[PDB]
Amino acid sequence: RQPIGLVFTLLLFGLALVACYHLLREIDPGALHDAIADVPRPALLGALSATALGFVILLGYEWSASRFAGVTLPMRSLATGGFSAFAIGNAVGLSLLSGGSVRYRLYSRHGIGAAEIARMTLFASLSLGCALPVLAALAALCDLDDAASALHLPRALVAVIAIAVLSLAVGLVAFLARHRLPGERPSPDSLLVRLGRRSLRLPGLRLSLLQLLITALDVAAAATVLYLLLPETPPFAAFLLVYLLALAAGVLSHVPGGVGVFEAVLLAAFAGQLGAAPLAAALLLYRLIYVVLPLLLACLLLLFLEARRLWVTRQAIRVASGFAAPILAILVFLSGVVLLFSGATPAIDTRLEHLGFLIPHRLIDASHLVASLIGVLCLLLAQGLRRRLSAAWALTLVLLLVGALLSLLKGFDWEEASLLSLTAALLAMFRRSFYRPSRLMEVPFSPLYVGASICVVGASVWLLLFANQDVHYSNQLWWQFALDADAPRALRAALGSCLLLLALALGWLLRAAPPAIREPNAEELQRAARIIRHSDQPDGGLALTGDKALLFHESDDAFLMYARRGRSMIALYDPIGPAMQRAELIWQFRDLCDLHHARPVFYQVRAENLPFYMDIGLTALKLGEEARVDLLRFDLENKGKEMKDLRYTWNRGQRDGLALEFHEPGQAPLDELKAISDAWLRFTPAYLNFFRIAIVRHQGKPVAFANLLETDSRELASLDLMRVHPDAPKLTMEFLMLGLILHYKAQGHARFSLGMVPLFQGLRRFKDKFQPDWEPRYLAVPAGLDPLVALADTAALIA
Amino acid sequence: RQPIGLVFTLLLFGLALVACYHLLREIDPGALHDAIADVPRPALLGALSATALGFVILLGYEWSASRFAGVTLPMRSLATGGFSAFAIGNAVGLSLLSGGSVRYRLYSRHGIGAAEIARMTLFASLSLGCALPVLAALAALCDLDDAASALHLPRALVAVIAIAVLSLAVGLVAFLARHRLPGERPSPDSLLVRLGRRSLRLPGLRLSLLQLLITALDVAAAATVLYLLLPETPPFAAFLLVYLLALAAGVLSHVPGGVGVFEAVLLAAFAGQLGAAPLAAALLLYRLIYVVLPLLLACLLLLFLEARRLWVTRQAIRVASGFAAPILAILVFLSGVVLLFSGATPAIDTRLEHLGFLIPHRLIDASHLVASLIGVLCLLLAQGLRRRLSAAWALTLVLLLVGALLSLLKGFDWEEASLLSLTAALLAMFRRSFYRPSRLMEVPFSPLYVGASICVVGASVWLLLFANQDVHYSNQLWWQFALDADAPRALRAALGSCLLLLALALGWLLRAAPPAIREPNAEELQRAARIIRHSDQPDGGLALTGDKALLFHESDDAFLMYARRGRSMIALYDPIGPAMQRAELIWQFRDLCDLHHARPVFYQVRAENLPFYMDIGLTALKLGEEARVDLLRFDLENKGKEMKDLRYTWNRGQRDGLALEFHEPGQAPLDELKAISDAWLRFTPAYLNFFRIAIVRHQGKPVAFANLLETDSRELASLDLMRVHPDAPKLTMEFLMLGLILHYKAQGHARFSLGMVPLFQGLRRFKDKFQPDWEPRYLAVPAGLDPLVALADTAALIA
Ligand SMILES: CCCCCCCCCCCCCCCCCC(=O)O[C@@H](COC(=O)CCCCCCCCCCCCCCC)COP(=O)(O)OC[C@H](O)CO
Ligand SMILES: CCCCCCCCCCCCCCCCCC(=O)O[C@@H](COC(=O)CCCCCCCCCCCCCCC)COP(=O)(O)OC[C@H](O)CO
Numbered sequence A, B: 001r002q003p004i005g006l007v008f009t010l011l012l013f014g015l016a017l018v019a020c021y022h023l024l025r026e027i028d029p030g031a032l033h034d035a036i037a038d039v040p041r042p043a044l045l046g047a048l049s050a051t052a053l054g055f056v057i058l059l060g061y062e063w064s065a066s067r068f069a070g071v072t073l074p075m076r077s078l079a080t081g082g083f084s085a086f087a088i089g090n091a092v093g094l095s096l097l098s099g100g101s102v103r104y105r106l107y108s109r110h111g112i113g114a115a116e117i118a119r120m121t122l123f124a125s126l127s128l129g130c131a132l133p134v135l136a137a138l139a140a141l142c143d144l145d146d147a148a149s150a151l152h153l154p155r156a157l158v159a160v161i162a163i164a165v166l167s168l169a170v171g172l173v174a175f176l177a178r179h180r181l182p183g184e185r186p187s188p189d190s191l192l193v194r195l196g197r198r199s200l201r202l203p204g205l206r207l208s209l210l211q212l213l214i215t216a217l218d219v220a221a222a223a224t225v226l227y228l229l230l231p232e233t234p235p236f237a238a239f240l241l242v243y244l245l246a247l248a249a250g251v252l253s254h255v256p257g258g259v260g261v262f263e264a265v266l267l268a269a270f271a272g273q274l275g276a277a278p279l280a281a282a283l284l285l286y287r288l289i290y291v292v293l294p295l296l297l298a299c300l301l302l303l304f305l306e307a308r309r310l311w312v313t314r315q316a317i318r319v320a321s322g323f324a325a326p327i328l329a330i331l332v333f334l335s336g337v338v339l340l341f342s343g344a345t346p347a348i349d350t351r352l353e354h355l356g357f358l359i360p361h362r363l364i365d366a367s368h369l370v371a372s373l374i375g376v377l378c379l380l381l382a383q384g385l386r387r388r389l390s391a392a393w394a395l396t397l398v399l400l401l402v403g404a405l406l407s408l409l410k411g412f413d414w415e416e417a418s419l420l421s422l423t424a425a426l427l428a429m430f431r432r433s434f435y436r437p438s439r440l441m442e443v444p445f446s447p448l449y450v451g452a453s454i455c456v457v458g459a460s461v462w463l464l465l466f467a468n469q470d471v472h473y474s475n476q477l478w479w480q481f482a483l484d485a486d487a488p489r490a491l492r493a494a495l496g497s498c499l500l501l502l503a504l505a506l507g508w509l510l511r512a513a514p515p516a517i518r519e520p521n522a523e524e525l526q527r528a529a530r531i532i533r534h535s536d537q538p539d540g541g542l543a544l545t546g547d548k549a550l551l552f553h554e555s556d557d558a559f560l561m562y563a564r565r566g567r568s569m570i571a572l573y574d575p576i577g578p579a580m581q582r583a584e585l586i587w588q589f590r591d592l593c594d595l596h597h598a599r600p601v602f603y604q605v606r607a608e609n610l611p612f613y614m615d616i617g618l619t620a621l622k623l624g625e626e627a628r629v630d631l632l633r634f635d636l637e638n639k640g641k642e643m644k645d646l647r648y649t650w651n652r653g654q655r656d657g658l659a660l661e662f663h664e665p666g667q668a669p670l671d672e673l674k675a676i677s678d679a680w681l682r683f684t685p686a687y688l689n690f691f692r693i694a695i696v697r698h699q700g701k702p703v704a705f706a707n708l709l710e711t712d713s714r715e716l717a718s719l720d721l722m723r724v725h726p727d728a729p730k731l732t733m734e735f736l737m738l739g740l741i742l743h744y745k746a747q748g749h750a751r752f753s754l755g756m757v758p759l760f761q762g763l764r765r766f767k768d769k770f771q772p773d774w775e776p777r778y779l780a781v782p783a784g785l786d787p788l789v790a791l792a793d794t795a796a797l798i799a
């Protein structure tokens, strides 16, 4: 899907550029500049105002999603999440940080579930998508003659299509209303409908209406931004209709911003009626005001909140996995786009005139080329930053400063230099955000990032051809080094960019194959055992089975056991070591999974590392609850119903003649354990002789055994393998672990772990007999929240 | 001394500037520029060649010092140390990194003693100083008429003075040769002479001659650099004589480079004969070629070797305390000098012409002023860098980039911008060098750094008056903001620099008084005890006496006990904690001592932290040797004479009826210990109840006791207080500690410490009875290696 989807995305973008070139044949870059200058200042204020209104409506859009999801959030939190997610989501789309990814980060702080947020994201997306046909139909149905003239279709055709769409919408609403199950309601404003296979959660009448009203105002507001920037305008009904179709085409095309496809359609519709230059100027200004501007504001806002959190919560925040790294990857990517577009466009004659006296003329040429190559590097380094490489931070920050310098030496492009400098100043402030000391050469290949780069380089060549259309091409142009010669500087830059991008991409893709997964050897198992001993986490013991691969840190003070099953790679627990070692290992695991084209899964993780799993792009699903008794507050002279039942079980066990014995590793009765294991029925001598075995006996004869996970420290201890005979008494097993607890209390252990119960009722009650302290265990899995998949699933179930 | 010495240094510099202004009254900056352009290219090559020769001679200068000191070093090491020490030493003098400080750092790697290096430094300095009169006298004695005409003195006078100097030199040589003690010789090429009070170590005849020959060639070579840059020249004899006197005056004046005083004298001598412009051009070029150039090369060389060491030895080097921080403080200081001098000088008319079209004219004025203020900040921040503040690194690196930018916006000063950028590029590479996270606001006041800044600002105002002498001053000049107006830009900058420097210096000096030293409270003692437990070093126990101040780290994972005695502050051991915590604490201690105007002394330090003591500017003196027995190789079934004597002592002790008992803290027989303490004669119950006491008894009655320093780990354990009765057997004490060793071997301790012997023979033998492993303990003390002090001491002893 990914490769095909990316290829058909690039083709659509490419075709759209070709379309836009042909539609702007009769216009020169002069006419465009005049058209941009022409639009009056009241109109720009009108646009900016309409933009502000149009983004206020999206906050109410976010509110409706919270009501649907049944999520209570503060107003300031919904505001920030609403703005940032819609601002970034609309701009970059899927390429970099998406709407869902923003929502999840933001709304995980307040303890909103991963399921809830996913349900908020889907509602936010689908509601526009499914309203767009209805809104379009209604728009066309007012003044059909104008709508017909705009689309250049028969009046009868567009009439029946509009009617058909409305009728189908009504028919659908009536159908899903038919299967409305009464009684139960997930949230105040929701329904649960049944179709046979799956239950489906839909909004209520009141919420459906409100959402449609919000969607209506939002579209109108957005279209209004473009309507005000047009000197001469068509009837609004037809204009709105076209805008909605163009918007649809942009969405379906899966082009990040909707760029190219949106413009192409608008241009196509109103090529002749309005004129190219006014429309092309309006479309450009529309993009800047409604798309780019709120993105920058959102980016800044999120950086501001990150910076603030670092200032106030200095102690709490340690490793730093927040918003800075994604956001700064965007800004650095945009910085590369600026450099590349600046190069394609010719310089101002006045600046070159004077700068010719300050600089050698042949250095202007050198500066111009180098700036364009730095531009390409900026596009690719955006990935490195996203993965929190410190090498990527240092290298970027150098290139941005050099790129800002060569921007001034090029054609005194002080606007390009100012943006690049400002990006550098931001990237500098967040040095600690990029903490990984991995090589840049070992970053896994990302088709998306390469695809995005190719699009930008494509767009720049489109801009080269447009901006330098006054000159007659020739074979000699490439070798002209003059000052007035602007077109040769474009050409040479364009070629340089394309060749570098090609070279790097080939150098990236044609790389040595990654080593195959192998079970650990004796040395590694011994080294793992060492780490487990000099650590807190005893659950690490399962590593020493030697049936699952071990991934070691560079310092070799931490590891992370995992195993490949099907098309996924499941880690068994959190990494084993300090917080920083944990963070580097989690990123190492993501890297390893990306090199093997496998889905990174984490099994049974604690809540403390959830932000790091968020960072690499996983969602915490509530797997089960792990119970662990506290030995500090546990005492055998206390009172309680369950406590009295336990003391009864204990004393009855002692009177019966049950005895408990502890054997250190090496001196275990292997013959007995084997016989017991066989009677019950991994169990290997190598695995067993790593741990201390507690054997309970009934009148001398061994009645059960249990190996004990334990570290050199006394913070925690657990039990993995534990088997009892069928013929053994029922209270013997309960006596055993009670004896274990007593022994650990004598040794002076802080805590003791029993185990995890998923979602079992008998096991849950049995654990609850000891009155333990519960703690949630999570499962981390990738965020598969594609709107199209969900809509296709809905449509399939309905049909 | 320091305040008086610094004041009389500044006055001499000031007076010298006034002198140089008056001597260059009849010359305009135009005539100087022409004179600088006039000197031919063969002459410059002649100068550069003479410089290269003149610095090759200084390597042989270094060699002679090694022979005198009796130091064997590799040729490459002597070369580097020779070059770097003489290059930096001659340039910056005493202000920043000095010759001795360079030598000590460089020659500490090869395990050369602190005493030896000090003796190498003194010889390197004094040999020139004491040869300079002789060389001068001899020079004058060739062609007395020319020498008389140069000095404008009578021929008879200069004759008798020269004779008197030579006669006195011969008389001195004969006198010290008289008291030449035969037999003993510290080194092959040295003598030991006696005058009654102190023994004095002098070079041999052969070494004295060779040193004088080396000194002769060196001076000649240096003078030759200046001689070739003169179009029209006087007789060389007289020229050399003057050069030597000017050099003397420069040295005596204690002006860092000899700048001002040297030029003043040369100018004074050959004002009329040669002409101002040729001489003033030659003096400037001489400074650049012979002084500034080798400094930069030395700086680069030392940075290169640091960078290489970081690349190859990544694992070994951890905290980074080498050459980068001093060297980069110099380069950043020079960068501030460049900014300040650039501002004082008027801009090129051609550049302003064109840059006027690219920039707003009023921004040129703003850029010009801001650049000069950044210049002043660069001078002061040089200190912060020296003390390895990370805040200072970040702030500098920002100001250098802004300063390099405003250099281009000022008058397109691309030379200033290029230097500043290159400094930034270096400073960036060594980010990890500045590792301390202390506040910039808490840096102690340094009169020297403030004095240096005032000199630079003084020099800039001298340059302002010289460079802008064509304009007529008026009260209105200050308020003129034009493009052609260069002199007002100088004035406004000059005033701004002076006011900022004044303001900061006053804000620095008038600061709150530092809190007084107080003994620790119960909480601190308890917190110290905690640290000691969770650590390796048991010698930290002496902190819990509570009679000495405790300095805690910000993390509170490490501390450093110290006490004030007289005018010094003695730390008792190395800091207690990790390597990074140790390095931050040592710097904290330096800071604390500088705020209280006290000499930082470290008592009984290990060899592992010697580089960090080097960093803050202390010299390791061999205090004593600490013996510590290794329990891994120690066994009671081994063979050996001393081992058999120990086993005899043990078994005889057991047969006699000596018994050893171990009491945990709290359950000590206080009544007994008190009685034993009184019988022997800090001893307080609070101090005693922190440690485990081992009490040996003779037939039941307690015969001795000894508290045991110990941590939670088993890496090391010691004993501090240990008293025995006069009437107790002689082998009872030896049995006691043998029992202690056996007990620690049973507990499974890695090592065990006995104690330190200074320089005692009986104690040394007693420790050697157990066949321990010796390890040197050092004393860290400031480096008081002032040539004048040593010469005054020598002169006093001779007389
Ligand atoms: C009309 C002319 C206008 C001139 C411009 C005037 C205004 C300039 C304002 C510039 C301020 C922005 C720079 C602030 C960066 C934050 C500093 C920082 O944190 O730097 C980090 C990175 O280190 C740096 O030094 C980065 C330097 C790069 C800054 C680049 C931005 C400035 C760009 C200036 C123009 C450059 C030229 C462009 C044109 C060619 C170090 O972080 P740390 O956590 O390791 O250290 C913190 C310390 O311990 C204290 O707590
Ligand atoms: C034309 C619209 C209709 C058809 C669209 C379909 C075809 C798509 C392909 C082309 C789309 C973009 C074309 C127009 C973009 C702007 C062109 C432009 O002016 O580019 C300048 C440079 O490129 C841009 O400005 C690019 C703008 C788009 C991206 C901006 C992102 C902003 C964020 C950057 C990172 C900074 C982050 C810090 C800020 C918080 C260079 O031209 P100049 O002559 O104006 O500049 C010279 C001199 O400096 C001043 O005159």
Ligand SMILES: CCCCCCCCCCCCCCCCCC(=O)O[C@@H](COC(=O)CCCCCCCCCCCCCCC)COP(=O)(O)OC[C@H](O)CO
Pocket: A363, A390, A391, A393, A394, A395, A397, A398, A401, A402, A405, A437, B401, B404, B405, B406, B408, B417, B421, B424, B425, B428, B429, B431, B432
């Ligand atoms: C004719 C035009 C000529 C144009 C110039 C072309 C040549 C430019 C060459 C510049 C290269 C020098 C910069 C190298 C600096 C070392 C990088 C570095 O380590 O930076 C540290 C500081 O961080 C930075 O990003 C510093 C950036 C500042 C660099 C300043 C020098 C460049 C100056 C360019 C011109 C600026 C404009 C001047 C004029 C206004 C980060 O160290 P770290 O240990 O934290 O990270 C290492 C990582 O883990 C990988 O191992």
Ligand SMILES: CCCCCCCCCCCCCCCCCC(=O)O[C@@H](COC(=O)CCCCCCCCCCCCCCC)COP(=O)(O)OC[C@H](O)CO
Pocket: B017, B020, B260, B263, B280, B281, B283, B284, B292, B296, B331, B334, B335, B337, B338, B341, B342, B345, B346, B347, B348, B412, B413, B414, B415, B416, B419, B420, B422, B423, B459, B462, B463
């Ligand atoms: C005059 C000699 C006899 C009398 C001496 C007694 C009086 C002492 C006080 C004055 C001493 C210095 C006077 C002359 C210094 C140089 C003047 C000069 O040219 O200054 C320029 C700037 O100042 C300097 O260059 C100062 C030079 C001295 C210090 C240099 C240190 C180098 C290291 C700096 C740090 C960089 C580190 C990285 C490099 C490895 C600005 O003038 P400009 O017109 O040449 O420049 C404009 C344009 O850019 C090009 O024309």
